[PDB]
Design a protein around this nucleic acid. Structure first.
Ligand SMILES: [Mg+2]
Ligand SMILES: [Mg+2]
Ligand SMILES: [Mg+2]
Ligand SMILES: [Mg+2]
Ligand SMILES: [Mg+2]
Ligand SMILES: [Mg+2]
Ligand SMILES: [Mg+2]
Ligand SMILES: [Mg+2]
Ligand SMILES: [Mg+2]
Ligand SMILES: [Mg+2]
Ligand SMILES: [Mg+2]
Ligand SMILES: [Mg+2]
Ligand SMILES: [Mg+2]
Ligand SMILES: [Mg+2]
Ligand SMILES: [Mg+2]
Ligand SMILES: [Mg+2]
Ligand SMILES: [Mg+2]
Ligand SMILES: [Mg+2]
Ligand SMILES: [Mg+2]
Ligand SMILES: [Mg+2]
Ligand SMILES: [Mg+2]
Ligand SMILES: [Mg+2]
Ligand SMILES: [Mg+2]
Ligand SMILES: [Mg+2]
Ligand SMILES: [Mg+2]
Ligand SMILES: [Mg+2]
Ligand SMILES: [Mg+2]
Ligand SMILES: [Mg+2]
Ligand SMILES: [Mg+2]
Ligand SMILES: [Mg+2]
Ligand SMILES: [Mg+2]
Ligand SMILES: [Mg+2]
Ligand SMILES: [Mg+2]
Ligand SMILES: [Mg+2]
Ligand SMILES: [Mg+2]
Ligand SMILES: [Mg+2]
Ligand SMILES: [Mg+2]
Ligand SMILES: [Mg+2]
Ligand SMILES: [Mg+2]
Ligand SMILES: [Mg+2]
Ligand SMILES: [Mg+2]
Ligand SMILES: [Mg+2]
Ligand SMILES: [Mg+2]
Ligand SMILES: [Mg+2]
Ligand SMILES: [Mg+2]
Ligand SMILES: [Mg+2]
Ligand SMILES: [Mg+2]
Ligand SMILES: [Mg+2]
Ligand SMILES: [Mg+2]
Ligand SMILES: [Mg+2]
Ligand SMILES: [Mg+2]
Ligand SMILES: [Mg+2]
Ligand SMILES: [Mg+2]
Ligand SMILES: [Mg+2]
Ligand SMILES: [Mg+2]
Ligand SMILES: [Mg+2]
Ligand SMILES: [Mg+2]
Ligand SMILES: [Mg+2]
Ligand SMILES: [Mg+2]
Ligand SMILES: [Mg+2]
Ligand SMILES: [Mg+2]
Ligand SMILES: [Mg+2]
Ligand SMILES: [Mg+2]
Ligand SMILES: [Mg+2]
Ligand SMILES: [Mg+2]
Ligand SMILES: [Mg+2]
Ligand SMILES: [Mg+2]
Ligand SMILES: [Mg+2]
Ligand SMILES: [Mg+2]
Ligand SMILES: [Mg+2]
Ligand SMILES: [Mg+2]
Ligand SMILES: [Mg+2]
Ligand SMILES: [Mg+2]
Ligand SMILES: [Mg+2]
Ligand SMILES: [Mg+2]
Ligand SMILES: [Mg+2]
Ligand SMILES: [Mg+2]
Ligand SMILES: [Mg+2]
Ligand SMILES: [Mg+2]
Ligand SMILES: [Mg+2]
Ligand SMILES: [Mg+2]
Ligand SMILES: [Mg+2]
Ligand SMILES: [Mg+2]
Ligand SMILES: [Mg+2]
Ligand SMILES: [Mg+2]
Ligand SMILES: [Mg+2]
Ligand SMILES: [Mg+2]
Ligand SMILES: [Mg+2]
Ligand SMILES: [Mg+2]
Ligand SMILES: [Mg+2]
Ligand SMILES: [Mg+2]
Ligand SMILES: [Mg+2]
Ligand SMILES: [Mg+2]
Ligand SMILES: [Mg+2]
Ligand SMILES: [Mg+2]
Ligand SMILES: [Mg+2]
Ligand SMILES: [Mg+2]
Ligand SMILES: [Mg+2]
Ligand SMILES: [Mg+2]
Ligand SMILES: [Mg+2]
Ligand SMILES: [Mg+2]
Ligand SMILES: [Mg+2]
Ligand SMILES: [Mg+2]
Ligand SMILES: [Mg+2]
Ligand SMILES: [Mg+2]
Ligand SMILES: [Mg+2]
Ligand SMILES: [Mg+2]
Ligand SMILES: [Mg+2]
Ligand SMILES: [Mg+2]
Ligand SMILES: [Mg+2]
Ligand SMILES: [Mg+2]
Ligand SMILES: [Mg+2]
Ligand SMILES: [Mg+2]
Ligand SMILES: [Mg+2]
Ligand SMILES: [Mg+2]
Ligand SMILES: [Mg+2]
Ligand SMILES: [Mg+2]
Ligand SMILES: [Mg+2]
Ligand SMILES: [Mg+2]
Ligand SMILES: [Mg+2]
Ligand SMILES: [Mg+2]
Ligand SMILES: [Mg+2]
Ligand SMILES: [Mg+2]
Ligand SMILES: [Mg+2]
Ligand SMILES: [Mg+2]
Ligand SMILES: [Mg+2]
Ligand SMILES: [Mg+2]
Ligand SMILES: [Mg+2]
Ligand SMILES: [Mg+2]
Ligand SMILES: [Mg+2]
Ligand SMILES: [Mg+2]
Ligand SMILES: [Mg+2]
Ligand SMILES: [Mg+2]
Ligand SMILES: [Mg+2]
Ligand SMILES: [Mg+2]
Ligand SMILES: [Mg+2]
Ligand SMILES: [Mg+2]
Ligand SMILES: [Mg+2]
Ligand SMILES: [Mg+2]
Ligand SMILES: [Mg+2]
Ligand SMILES: [Mg+2]
Ligand SMILES: [Mg+2]
Ligand SMILES: [Mg+2]
Ligand SMILES: [Mg+2]
Ligand SMILES: [Mg+2]
Ligand SMILES: [Mg+2]
Ligand SMILES: [Mg+2]
Ligand SMILES: [Mg+2]
Ligand SMILES: [Mg+2]
Ligand SMILES: [Mg+2]
Ligand SMILES: [Mg+2]
Ligand SMILES: [Mg+2]
Ligand SMILES: [Mg+2]
Ligand SMILES: [Mg+2]
Ligand SMILES: [Mg+2]
Ligand SMILES: [Mg+2]
Ligand SMILES: [Mg+2]
Ligand SMILES: [Mg+2]
Ligand SMILES: [Mg+2]
Ligand SMILES: [Mg+2]
Ligand SMILES: [Mg+2]
Ligand SMILES: [Mg+2]
Ligand SMILES: [Mg+2]
Ligand SMILES: [Mg+2]
Ligand SMILES: [Mg+2]
Ligand SMILES: [Mg+2]
Ligand SMILES: [Mg+2]
Ligand SMILES: [Mg+2]
Ligand SMILES: [Mg+2]
Ligand SMILES: [Mg+2]
Ligand SMILES: [Mg+2]
Ligand SMILES: [Mg+2]
Ligand SMILES: [Mg+2]
Ligand SMILES: [Mg+2]
Ligand SMILES: [Mg+2]
Ligand SMILES: [Mg+2]
Ligand SMILES: [Mg+2]
Lengths: 117, 150
RNA sequence: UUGACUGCGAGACAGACACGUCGAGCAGGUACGAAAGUAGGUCUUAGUGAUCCGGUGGUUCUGUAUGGAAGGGCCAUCGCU
RNA sequence: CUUGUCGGGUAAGUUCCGACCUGCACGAAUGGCGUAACGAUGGCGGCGCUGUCUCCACCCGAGACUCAGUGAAAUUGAAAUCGCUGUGAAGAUGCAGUGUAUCCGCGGCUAGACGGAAAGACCCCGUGAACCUUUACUGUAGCUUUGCACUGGACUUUGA
RNA sequence: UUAAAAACACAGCACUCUGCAAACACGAAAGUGGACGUAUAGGGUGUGACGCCUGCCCGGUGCCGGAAGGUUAAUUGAUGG
RNA sequence: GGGGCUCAAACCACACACCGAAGCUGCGGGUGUCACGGUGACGCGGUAGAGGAGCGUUCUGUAAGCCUGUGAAGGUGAGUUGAGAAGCUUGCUGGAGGUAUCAGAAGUGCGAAUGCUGACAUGAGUAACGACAAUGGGUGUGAAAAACACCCACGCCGAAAGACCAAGGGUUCCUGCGCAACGUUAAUCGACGCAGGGUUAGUCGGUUCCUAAGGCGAGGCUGAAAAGCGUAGUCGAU
RNA sequence: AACCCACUCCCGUUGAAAAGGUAGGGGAUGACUUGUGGAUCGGAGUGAAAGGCUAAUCAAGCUCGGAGAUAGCUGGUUCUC
RNA sequence: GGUCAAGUGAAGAAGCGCAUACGGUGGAUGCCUUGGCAGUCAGAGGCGAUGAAAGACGUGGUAGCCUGCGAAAAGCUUCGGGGAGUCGGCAAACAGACUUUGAUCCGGAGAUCUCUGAAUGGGGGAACCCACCUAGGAUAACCUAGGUAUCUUGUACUGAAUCCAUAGGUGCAAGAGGCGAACCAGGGGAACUGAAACAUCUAAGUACCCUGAGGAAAAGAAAUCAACCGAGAUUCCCUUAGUAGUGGCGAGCGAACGGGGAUUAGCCCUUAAGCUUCAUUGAUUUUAGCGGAACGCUCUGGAAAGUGCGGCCAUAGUGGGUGAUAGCCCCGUACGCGAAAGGAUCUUUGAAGUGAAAUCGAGUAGGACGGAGCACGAGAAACUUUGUCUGAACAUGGGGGGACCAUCCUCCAAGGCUAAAUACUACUGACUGACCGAUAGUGAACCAGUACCGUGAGGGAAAGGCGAAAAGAACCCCGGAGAGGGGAGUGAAAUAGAACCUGAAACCGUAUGCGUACAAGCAGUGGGAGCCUACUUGUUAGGUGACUGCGUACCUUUUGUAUAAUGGGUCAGCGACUUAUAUUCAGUGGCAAGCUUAACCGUAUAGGGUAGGCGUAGCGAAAGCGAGUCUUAAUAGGGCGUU
């Protein structure tokens, strides 16, 4: 029972080269280079699912700082006053009101400021 | 494999991978690394461990209603047409016929018949009794199975 | 005066193995002491070399048809900077 | 030791020539000391001659360069392939900070890519290999001693 | 096919072996070369035209000679066990 | 680390706030062990290595079955399903075979071994085009002349770069027709392709006659065997 | 001079050439050069001796066998959870 | 509406990137097969001086090469078969013919049979040169047909030294010589390797060289083993048993007795079985052939064997191929028949030879020295054999029983011949395969031991596929009376067009969309505007990715690699834990104080065969004793074992 490798081997190279679509030069059209490129791409994707959560919180905090200082307060004092009063709204929702619902953001900063924090 | 006696090139200096013979398993026309030789795929099965499977097979034919028992089974003169007609009265198409002795007339008929086999009590193997859709035995063949299988 | 005894030996210490160390107590016969008793070398820790092979003293073992012998086994003991 | 010391040759001589004897460690057929002629032999010094040089200049042919035709090679993980100062498998185009910088050829030069070429030849290791040596071990061809055989007669000396 | 030389050869010198079926060499052997030669010849070794010369040591190792005496092989087989 | 920093953005004390990880919590999933009869609690980084469970490929049985010219295997896209190896459905191409399920056997899964074979890149339209005796016109032929043919005129060898024997080679010799490949460029030309033709001996050279070195060698002598040496003889030119 | 050789410089080193070329250089009646035929070879031959030469291969030629010699040494070793 | 100033900044690509669509190169993949590989059952086991194996040259209507033939040359003569086409293949055309008065074709027998080659009349550089003798025929410068090697054996004639006769010399008869893959019996005889070095030892009496014989060979009928009971020639298989032994007592080597089988057989020296060759009695095979059953309609289709419906044959139903898948279309198949003439085997019964050595075994048995063989390496070393040297007895005698002696037992050496069971396959036929399917399988599917390489011995490739059928593209146009194309035609299909099935990847192009000329690095990943396309007209799908956070390949080897440490230019195909025999443990089964067979029979996976192996009892070095036993003076103690 002699087994030939032709059909299975070709069907396995084509799976890798389909994931390397859009890469530059030999990274999309030769298997040896493309196999390494696909592994590295998956390595970055696993790592960058952690970093997406970090990058967005750093952007919400930056926008809340910009919108709190327009009402006369800093970010670190606004967060201390929200905890002091009762408010437990996300930073994602807080940064959304800063850009879109500017009148509702002022009432929150004024409520946090009445807690003297 | 024929040929391949001397080194293709010298050990050092040529800038090529080391070679010792042109008929090496790595090369194109070279030999097979673990080439086969003729051998026997014969196992050992105990005498009593073979008879217990016959008992187990025969008991399952009765439970599954594949075993048919008749009082003698014979045909006169070797004719496939004559044997085909007699099996239709019993309603059997794919049948294994087991008898105490395979008569010459019964053997000559059913030889060219497609889904019918005629065997002997000691000629009936484990595979045939599972393969055919029905097994038709005679009373003499039944009294011989109990002798051999206890 | 010969206990620098013979057969053992509960139990331990050490320790990869092969080796090594201590030892109450029992049986045989002893030596000193009136006796209880002490004695299985020396105050203790170095002074040593496996197996194979060959030699010597014993032996209710074996011994190529049988009776013996040769040879072999067992116990003791000699030959290695 | 040592470029020993003295003399000659040069403006200046670790080389050269002549001596001294303190011969690390000359020496008499593995010959000692000389020697005419000879040497594509080693060292030193002169005359002539000169682009060897100060210090290069001009000129003539064949390439290099451009056009038409034919058409290789070693090499090559992939490249969107800068400098500096640090860091770091301890000498970075690729890391960090920083500075510079539009995109692409052609003619030239070789500072780097620890550039290409040859599984380092130097060094060590392997209870690796070859060949060579001998008063290493064990053998052995050849040469040689004696017994028996082929192989006999007689006389004499001489021991049991 | 990176070394042409001071390296090799050389004429000359010396030592030593060889009496002819020579020494010596190639050959399991027959045989062949030496040589259809015969010590003014043949082989081996060292030195290296020519000139003047070539000193001392025979303890070591080799070679040559001697044969008295010690050891000393196969062989033989007294005696004892 | 840089910009820059002097009642600091430095240092020394104290205070409160905030940022900050794959750590902890929240929400939704998957798994291992143990306990109880699907719930609980407590785990789930990993090389050498041990243990457990699977996917896919070729062949045999199931299978004289089932699918298939109203289109098999194979190739090429799209969609979709699982934790993964992978599965499934379809458009186009192709034109005749394939193998559900459960078992049984393995030439059973490649990126590396300065791996083997074939194909194709980079260097790159880059080096080079093989003695620096040397070429310039005119005409002809031709699809097309620097190179072919002829003419006029220059150069080079001439103890050869001219003639002739021998060895070696073997049709390369001449003619007609050709230019794909070969010719380091083109070619109408050729030691190139196709087809014909061409070599005439008493005196030339062999053979025949004779021998050298040497070979072989009846008988013969020697040697485990194969064989060695050698006499008569008979081969062997230079 | 021819012929045989190979002392120097340069070029060439992917060469016109797996050892050449242009300039110079040595011997050139002899221990000369050369054609044809023949003899000696693998632990063997031959060597005015360099461990040189024996078909671009020599501190033991090439070829085929023992043979897939041995390699405590480098390299490689292919699907999933 | 102007002028000025400031701010802002679309489009415009020499060329590149990604995606997509079409191509080109290339030859993978799939399917296929006239070629290979491994078995089983038979055959017959040789060919050659009557010239072999292996060749050179020739031979055809037309050039070459294969295949046959041999100057009578793809053939000549005879028998036997058959029953209409034929003049071999690559490989076609044009021609000439052959014949139902029996051709091509197949089988038996005959004739011819060049040159080389053991090569054999003598020489030679294989395929060449030169001769002599006898008989017959021509007259010129020959022709035809036979002979002429060497050695051995036999026979006849003859005749040296030398008298006789010996050597020697000629003439006749018979035989031999060379080739062949293996098997057999002998002569000579390694080393690598292992012993983790290496000498004894091993590898191994293997590899290799040489000499003989046969279809088989060899060996074979007790001067053999056993053990006081017996067996009964040789050969081969399974056990005893990896035991007894042997061994630098290391690595290793390794029996026999006793059992179970296959085969069955002995006969002579007071002359036998047997074997060989001729002549006859019958039988059976082999070399070629002959007969050999049963189907229609319909649908799709280029073409049915496929669909749907209904039948028939069966001692013949999973054969090959016919335009897609056929028991009933063809060739076959099961089953019956068949030989002018050759070969072979077995059978009678006759002759001849041989067996054959004469007469029961003398330089023999035994011994000493040095070696070989026995599983046994000097060891207490028996037995066989012999290179050197010696040397008996005569059945009231001699040989063995593992140093040696005594007693018993058992045989009769120094003379022969014998089948079967066993070994092998270069060669021929049939069948088979959980073998390969063109980088595989033989090196070789194809004009392969070729091309090519080497002075030679020797080494040694690559290279398959149009279509069902050549129906292989008439004719027109461009082009050099080209190469190559554009139409037209054939075909079911020419993007099936001869470099022809399918036709992947690397690699090279054309077209469209988006991006790219102030920008620094493993080229991705997370976020993300703008543009383009499609349509479900924006919480959609697809293509690009300005700008921005993070981010120094993979393998190996290492304490540690982005490492400037190794390896890889890329793609496609291939490429490394296997198999056999002995075992131990685990899982899963059958039997169970028992379990299981091996060789071998066999109706052949059944059934038989329980020789043997393991278990049910241990202790001791052993004799031995035994739920105990060993040590010991010891029933004490202790070791091992026991429900
Ligand atoms: Mg992209
Ligand atoms: Mg692509
Ligand atoms: Mg070889
Ligand atoms: Mg070899
Ligand atoms: Mg290299
Ligand atoms: Mg192969
Ligand atoms: Mg059985
Ligand atoms: Mg049937
Ligand atoms: Mg302890
Ligand atoms: Mg007292
Ligand atoms: Mg007392
Ligand atoms: Mg020892
Ligand atoms: Mg005895
Ligand atoms: Mg004794
Ligand atoms: Mg000095
Ligand atoms: Mg001085
Ligand atoms: Mg001075
Ligand atoms: Mg000077
Ligand atoms: Mg002197
Ligand atoms: Mg001296
Ligand atoms: Mg002097
Ligand atoms: Mg000279
Ligand atoms: Mg001088
Ligand atoms: Mg000067
Ligand atoms: Mg150009
Ligand atoms: Mg740059
Ligand atoms: Mg540093
Ligand atoms: Mg640095
Ligand atoms: Mg980087
Ligand atoms: Mg950086
Ligand atoms: Mg970093
Ligand atoms: Mg440049
Ligand atoms: Mg330069
Ligand atoms: Mg450079
Ligand atoms: Mg380098
Ligand atoms: Mg290497
Ligand atoms: Mg190295
Ligand atoms: Mg060295
Ligand atoms: Mg050592
Ligand atoms: Mg070591
Ligand atoms: Mg010279
Ligand atoms: Mg020189
Ligand atoms: Mg010299
Ligand atoms: Mg002399
Ligand atoms: Mg000298
Ligand atoms: Mg001198
Ligand atoms: Mg003296
Ligand atoms: Mg002396
Ligand atoms: Mg003397
Ligand atoms: Mg916080
Ligand atoms: Mg977090
Ligand atoms: Mg966590
Ligand atoms: Mg959870
Ligand atoms: Mg884990
Ligand atoms: Mg964890
Ligand atoms: Mg279709
Ligand atoms: Mg398939
Ligand atoms: Mg698909
Ligand atoms: Mg398809
Ligand atoms: Mg088919
Ligand atoms: Mg299946
Ligand atoms: Mg494989
Ligand atoms: Mg790999
Ligand atoms: Mg690959
Ligand atoms: Mg890998
Ligand atoms: Mg390479
Ligand atoms: Mg590779
Ligand atoms: Mg180009
Ligand atoms: Mg360049
Ligand atoms: Mg250039
Ligand atoms: Mg140029
Ligand atoms: Mg030129
Ligand atoms: Mg040139
Ligand atoms: Mg030229
Ligand atoms: Mg012209
Ligand atoms: Mg010209
Ligand atoms: Mg002139
Ligand atoms: Mg000629
Ligand atoms: Mg030629
Ligand atoms: Mg011509
Ligand atoms: Mg012409
Ligand atoms: Mg042209
Ligand atoms: Mg041309
Ligand atoms: Mg021509
Ligand atoms: Mg002669
Ligand atoms: Mg001779
Ligand atoms: Mg002779
Ligand atoms: Mg002559
Ligand atoms: Mg002549
Ligand atoms: Mg010449
Ligand atoms: Mg010059
Ligand atoms: Mg010159
Ligand atoms: Mg000259
Ligand atoms: Mg001179
Ligand atoms: Mg001469
Ligand atoms: Mg020779
Ligand atoms: Mg040699
Ligand atoms: Mg030297
Ligand atoms: Mg050669
Ligand atoms: Mg040479
Ligand atoms: Mg071997
Ligand atoms: Mg090897
Ligand atoms: Mg390495
Ligand atoms: Mg633009
Ligand atoms: Mg472009
Ligand atoms: Mg057979
Ligand atoms: Mg036979
Ligand atoms: Mg032929
Ligand atoms: Mg004739
Ligand atoms: Mg006829
Ligand atoms: Mg002849
Ligand atoms: Mg002859
Ligand atoms: Mg004759
Ligand atoms: Mg002749
Ligand atoms: Mg013969
Ligand atoms: Mg050895
Ligand atoms: Mg060893
Ligand atoms: Mg070893
Ligand atoms: Mg060694
Ligand atoms: Mg041996
Ligand atoms: Mg022998
Ligand atoms: Mg025969
Ligand atoms: Mg015999
Ligand atoms: Mg016997
Ligand atoms: Mg008896
Ligand atoms: Mg008998
Ligand atoms: Mg029929
Ligand atoms: Mg069929
Ligand atoms: Mg078809
Ligand atoms: Mg059919
Ligand atoms: Mg029909
Ligand atoms: Mg007798
Ligand atoms: Mg006699
Ligand atoms: Mg004897
Ligand atoms: Mg002896
Ligand atoms: Mg012996
Ligand atoms: Mg011993
Ligand atoms: Mg004797
Ligand atoms: Mg005897
Ligand atoms: Mg005896
Ligand atoms: Mg005895
Ligand atoms: Mg006899
Ligand atoms: Mg066959
Ligand atoms: Mg293919
Ligand atoms: Mg092939
Ligand atoms: Mg091949
Ligand atoms: Mg040749
Ligand atoms: Mg049509
Ligand atoms: Mg197509
Ligand atoms: Mg097609
Ligand atoms: Mg193609
Ligand atoms: Mg087809
Ligand atoms: Mg095609
Ligand atoms: Mg492609
Ligand atoms: Mg392009
Ligand atoms: Mg474009
Ligand atoms: Mg700027
Ligand atoms: Mg830009
Ligand atoms: Mg850049
Ligand atoms: Mg995104
Ligand atoms: Mg989108
Ligand atoms: Mg991005
Ligand atoms: Mg980015
Ligand atoms: Mg970054
Ligand atoms: Mg390292
Ligand atoms: Mg290191
Ligand atoms: Mg790297
Ligand atoms: Mg790192
Ligand atoms: Mg690297
Ligand atoms: Mg780098
Ligand atoms: Mg390196
Ligand atoms: Mg390294
Ligand atoms: Mg690597
Ligand atoms: Mg590399
Ligand atoms: Mg069980
Ligand atoms: Mg006890
Ligand atoms: Mg106990």
């Amino acid at each position: 029972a002699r087994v030939k490798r032709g059909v299975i081997a070709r069907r396995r190279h084509k799976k890798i080269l389909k994931l390397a679509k859009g890469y530059y030069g030999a990274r999309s059209r030769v298997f040896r280079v493309a196999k390494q490129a696909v592994i590295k791409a998956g390595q970055y994707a696993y790592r960058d699912r952690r970093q997406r959560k970090r990058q967005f919180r750093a952007l919400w905090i930056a926008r809340i700082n910009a919108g709190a200082r327009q009402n006369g307060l800093s970010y670190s004092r606004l967060i201390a006053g929200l905890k002091k009063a009762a408010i437990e709204i996300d930073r994602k929702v807080l940064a959304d009101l800063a850009v879109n619902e500017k009148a509702a953001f002022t009432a929150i900063v004024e409520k946090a400021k009445a807690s003297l924090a | 494999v024929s040929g391949g006696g001397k080194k293709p090139w010298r050990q050092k200096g040529t800038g090529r991978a080391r070679a010792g013979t042109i008929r090496s398993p790595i090369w194109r026309g070279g030999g097979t690394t673990f080439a086969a030789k003729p051998r026997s795929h014969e196992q050992k099965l105990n005498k009593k461990m073979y008879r217990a499977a016959l008992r187990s097979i025969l008991a399952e034919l009765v439970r599954l209603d594949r075993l048919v028992v008749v009082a003698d089974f014979a045909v006169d003169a070797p004719k496939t047409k004559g044997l085909v007609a007699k099996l239709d009265t019993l309603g059997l198409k794919d049948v294994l016929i087991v008898t105490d002795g395979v008569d010459e007339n019964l053997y000559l008929a059913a030889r060219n018949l497609a889904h019918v086999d005629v065997r002997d009590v000691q000629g009936s193997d484990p595979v045939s009794l599972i393969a055919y859709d029905k097994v038709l035995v005679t009373v003499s063949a039944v009294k011989k199975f109990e002798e051999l299988l206890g």
